[PDB]
Amino acid sequence: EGVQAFIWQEFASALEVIPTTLAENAGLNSIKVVTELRSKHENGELND
Amino acid sequence: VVYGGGAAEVTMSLAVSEEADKQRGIDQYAFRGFAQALDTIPMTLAENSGLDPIGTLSTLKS
């Protein structure tokens, strides 16, 4: 609950460009792929 | 007739983000972009007036 926290939200959002770039190079839709990254990670803590 | 002063922009912005929560599809980020784009005019008024933009939009949104 601070302005430093609002910067950390943008820090977390901008860090997701690496799997987004992998989706565009592979031709897959980034939102469909990144939606699966969000769907499997709450249970899968690593190696996903 | 409508009351301006940044009220027309923010009142049209929060509803678009609310619709995106159930109308997700592929265009979920498209509604979020238009919701954030409408709020820029209040932030433009915050820059010219010399006030904190984040505190202003946080108080108006809440």
Curated annotation (Swiss-Prot), chain A:
It is found in: Cytoplasm. It comes from the Eukaryota. Molecular chaperone; assists the folding of proteins upon ATP hydrolysis. Known to play a role, in vitro, in the folding of actin and tubulin. In yeast may play a role in mitotic spindle formation. Present with 5530 molecules/cell in log phase SD medium. Heterooligomeric complex of about 850 to 900 kDa that forms two stacked rings, 12 to 16 nm in diameter. Belongs to the TCP-1 chaperonin family. This is T-complex protein 1 subunit delta. It comes from Saccharomyces cerevisiae (strain ATCC 204508 / S288c) (Baker's yeast).
Swiss-Prot record, chain B:
It comes from the Eukaryota. Transmembrane segments: none annotated. It is found in: Cytoplasm. Heterooligomeric complex of about 850 to 900 kDa that forms two stacked rings, 12 to 16 nm in diameter. Belongs to the TCP-1 chaperonin family. Molecular chaperone; assists the folding of proteins upon ATP hydrolysis. Known to play a role, in vitro, in the folding of actin and tubulin. In yeast may play a role in mitotic spindle formation. This is T-complex protein 1 subunit epsilon. It comes from Saccharomyces cerevisiae (strain ATCC 204508 / S288c) (Baker's yeast). The chain holds residues 439 to 500 of 562 of the full protein.
